[PDB]
Amino acid sequence: SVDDIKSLRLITAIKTPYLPDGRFDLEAYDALVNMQIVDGAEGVIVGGTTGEGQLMSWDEHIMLIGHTVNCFGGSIKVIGNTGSNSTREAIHATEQGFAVGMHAALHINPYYGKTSLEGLVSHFESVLPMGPTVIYNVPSRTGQDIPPGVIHTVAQSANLAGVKECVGNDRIKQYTDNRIVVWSGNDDQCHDAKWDYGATGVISVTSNLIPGLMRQLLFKGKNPSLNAKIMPLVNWLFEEPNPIGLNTALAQLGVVRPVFRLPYVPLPLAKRVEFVNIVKEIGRENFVGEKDVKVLDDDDFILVGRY
Amino acid sequence: SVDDIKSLRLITAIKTPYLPDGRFDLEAYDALVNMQIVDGAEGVIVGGTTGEGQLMSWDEHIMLIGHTVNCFGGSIKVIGNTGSNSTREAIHATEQGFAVGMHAALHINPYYGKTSLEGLVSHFESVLPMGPTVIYNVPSRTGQDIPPGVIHTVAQSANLAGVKECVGNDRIKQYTDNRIVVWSGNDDQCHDAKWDYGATGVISVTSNLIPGLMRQLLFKGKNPSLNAKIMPLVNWLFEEPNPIGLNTALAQLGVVRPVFRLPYVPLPLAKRVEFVNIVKEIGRENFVGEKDVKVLDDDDFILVGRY
Amino acid sequence: SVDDIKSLRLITAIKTPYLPDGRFDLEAYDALVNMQIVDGAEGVIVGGTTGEGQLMSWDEHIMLIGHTVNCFGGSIKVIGNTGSNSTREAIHATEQGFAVGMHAALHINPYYGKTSLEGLVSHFESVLPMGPTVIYNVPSRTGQDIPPGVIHTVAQSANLAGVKECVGNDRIKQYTDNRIVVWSGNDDQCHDAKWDYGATGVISVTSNLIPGLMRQLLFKGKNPSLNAKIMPLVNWLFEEPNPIGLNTALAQLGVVRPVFRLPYVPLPLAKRVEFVNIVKEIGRENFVGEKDVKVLDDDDFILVGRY
Amino acid sequence: SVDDIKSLRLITAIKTPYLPDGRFDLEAYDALVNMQIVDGAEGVIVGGTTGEGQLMSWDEHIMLIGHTVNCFGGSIKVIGNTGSNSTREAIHATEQGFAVGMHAALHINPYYGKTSLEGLVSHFESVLPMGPTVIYNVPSRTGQDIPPGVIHTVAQSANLAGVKECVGNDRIKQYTDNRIVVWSGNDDQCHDAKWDYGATGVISVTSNLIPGLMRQLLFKGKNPSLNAKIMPLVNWLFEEPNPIGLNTALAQLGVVRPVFRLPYVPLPLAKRVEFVNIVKEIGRENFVGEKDVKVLDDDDFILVGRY
Ligand SMILES: [Br-]
Ligand SMILES: [Br-]
Ligand SMILES: [Br-]
Ligand SMILES: [Br-]
Ligand SMILES: [Br-]
Ligand SMILES: [Br-]
Ligand SMILES: [Br-]
Ligand SMILES: [Br-]
Ligand SMILES: [Cl-]
Ligand SMILES: [Cl-]
Ligand SMILES: [Cl-]
Ligand SMILES: [Cl-]
Ligand SMILES: [Cl-]
């Protein structure tokens, strides 16, 4: 149901952990989703940008979606990132994603191979009939800012749940004033988006590391001292493009193996020493996992190009 | 060999024509490549941005690369667009592309799922050893500008042929002053890139339509009036994201079927009328094909989502 | 659990129904699985020989498996047919199959590209660790009778549930006397198999049509007259290779569309007239669906090659 | 043309060699094909049963086809095994194969998921329009003997080059007496097929090892003692299902790496010792490669399940 999605506040763009040979680490993955559920995350994006969907083959991706529904579908909402810059792929991945039982679809606009505003309408209308859909706007990554007019055109579909919006709180307000549910895509803006700009919540990267704190941040009420306290973490996580920092942090925490699928590559030593201090400053207990945080040696990391 | 690639002036990023069901129209494609050859185009990019590589499955792409080499490899240089935002795909497509006898690879930086500068080097160094390589910078599309420092780092490989640069002529000059071969990726800039900024040539969209005229611009010396003559065609070609304009124009010229793979959608009626006038002004004899240019009506066009 | 699969008695090799363009018709499929549940079937093979697994791409197949698990997993055992003549495919299909929550895998011996008995052991040991496994012997189709020595060798794995045996009741006896669970894969034999030869049950084609009668046959005691009654149906079902008859019969009953993926093709008119009389003799009320059975015209059937 | 294929007398079903990680070893492959050309083989089957087409993903397969055409097409006829038990795959693989320039297609009848005789005609008629076709009958592997009637039905197409026939010389004679070109697919029968039953040639496994000797058997009249001389090699090659013996023999000769894709596993030590004697008796100079034949130890062999 659409309204079940519209009412979600904390959705995690869950990271996809790997085995040393590059394959998904499903044991680690399950542990990750369990810690999300425990600390009150209400949804997960499967193979989003943070989940490195762009580096998956489709059978892996659909497997991971079906897996998450199968294991956790009764505790958390499952949102498959089945979007693509290719309409054919979007169509195919969306209908199969829904068939294995995902609750909603995340659809970005075609990136790289940008299309016209007419083309966008055609693209979204190809997948909107399939079920609850969250449209995903991230111009910094795609090359194209989806204008409000396009969002209003396709909002005629009952199946539009809302927008994962990344251009900023000004855009969110443009939408939330006009009866369109929005989740902030930026962790450094999402407190204000929720409390001041009418966002329903966040689709979050940082909730991978501190789900409990991100829950407190969105559920209880305004709280700038909590927002300020997590900000040094948030900044560290985005000095290089996401999910490079997240990947690096989760491995320092022991919850995932220090394995990267290329083109991503871990943060250097100096940055890794820094994270240890950010953890110490915020308190290890707020971070996922139980293991003492490590700095890790350069030689600990495994980069995979062929898998 | 790298020097054979370094000397090419006119490279056409060839359009990929479709059958009504959405499969490749090899009959129309073959005729397109021959018309490139007749008018002195020196190389082709297979499945580039213009060629809609982004919408192809890999079997189809490798097929088209091998087809092009088999039928035309003796008369024209074949450069497979085997780049990707995924290193695994880039590695895999590039070695398979070379195995079927392509002459060079075009490699963009990872788009959408952007990586760090360190990751860029890792990405590029995974494929440079395989053969002659052209690195492709188009930050409008990718969201990441490849810094000259990165280009200079990877230029330690003897397999770097040069750069398809899209940021502008001033960037081109930064490279050409420093021993780096550059092809302009901007038709509205390529005349001046060649004569004022040290560029070796162009990797062209517009040459799909007027290959003879583009050749003249790079081969004969500064010609401000020929350059001014093509400008209205170029401006038309890029009013919407390439290859929408090109796809539309080739259908109007009757050299391809009016079949579009989504998310692309033809230019509207008014622009199509405009194109008939543009052809008139420049002269029909300068455009590919023999058939009278048509406006085409809306319902002539076939939009393919499932293929 | 392995013991759970071992205690299954009535398992249906469910047919895979299609839409006019050759894609899976999930609406029809869901209704077929429900009718199996209502008349007591305890498990289903998904994409078996009868389910035309041979004609699926793996994305489609894992989708179907995950769909069946998601919709029916709590009411019925889902056995994914993840075997292949390629160990790589078998490995990959099986692990993905279990990850989306299938209860067991069906594993044939490599067919067409036959391997040595040693190769057979290597192949089965590649997949047995992954979960509960039914080994499928059908030398009339594979070209290779799996010898009991091989079965006894691989039976060292705690994950071997049993054998889907197609050679005959005397083979079955060899196994059941020696503590190996067996399901007959021959409908014309399965009654004797279960009552006289120790078979735990059947993996059935005919239950697709008359699940209630197949249940009665296997559950309520030795019944020579009931067995004799179904035999005209069973014989008709296998005049041409299965599932040609079943596909035809289900269309005639109106429970699936008259759509065939090639290389399969429907039974001719005279045979379809014959099916109407078999239905009248057994009684329409014993067959899946509510609609009057039809002969159907030759022109009703759609044959799909490209999908 | 079709006639160009019909006059071919010695065709090799070339082995596909692998690198330690399971990928194609194009360097070894190129040496194998070169050796075939040197000793007068006039065509190759690419990815046949002997070439382990059944273990290949389609992209590496079309790659290998396109590679063989690009590198050797001027010197040898390239026949892609694009046949399948799935008509969709057969259609798809065949046209893509011809697109990259293969000279003919090898087409088997659907194995394992066997179809009706009407089904077979449908299946073959989907691919016969694409290019010169060789129909492949080997019921010991398919479970279905293609009857003469089906061949005569499909022979109405001018694109039927002929039949690769494995059932025996008597079958060959029913065809050759009725204007249909045949290649024997049995090395132990091919001498007599040619000289006594009107076969045009062989499509050979054994020519992978001793191409010159096979040439002599087929181009130089009856020679029962040359024929008897090769027979112990042929018997050794087929004691376990082909290509297990050939893969083993080629490793021993050092012209390929001792690498197997599962389910295939090498012949045991005793047979390897036996091969060394077979080589001594026939004479090393007749076999491919210059290196001294080795026994090889169990330890040397690499079995790949995941690639
Ligand atoms: Br590790
Ligand atoms: Br462009
Ligand atoms: Br058309
Ligand atoms: Br009962
Ligand atoms: Br229908
Ligand atoms: Br009735
Ligand atoms: Br080796
Ligand atoms: Br020797
Ligand atoms: Cl953004
Ligand atoms: Cl600049
Ligand atoms: Cl059997
Ligand atoms: Cl027996
Ligand atoms: Cl045979």
Author numbering:
A (entry chain H), B (entry chain E), C (entry chain G), D (entry chain A): 21 to 327
How do the authors describe this structure?
The lysine-biosynthesis pathway commences with the condensation of pyruvate and (S)-aspartate semialdehyde (ASA), to form (4S)-4-hydroxy-2,3,4,5-tetrahydro-(2S)-dipicolinic acid (HTPA). This reaction is catalyzed by dihydrodipicolinate synthase (DHDPS), which is the product of an essential gene in bacteria. The ‘tight’ dimer interface also contains a cleft that binds the allosteric inhibitor, lysine, which mediates feedback inhibition in DHDPS enzymes from Gram-negative bacteria and plants. In this study, we show for the first time that DHDPS from the plant Vitis vinifera forms a homotetramer or dimer-of-dimers both in solution and the crystal state.
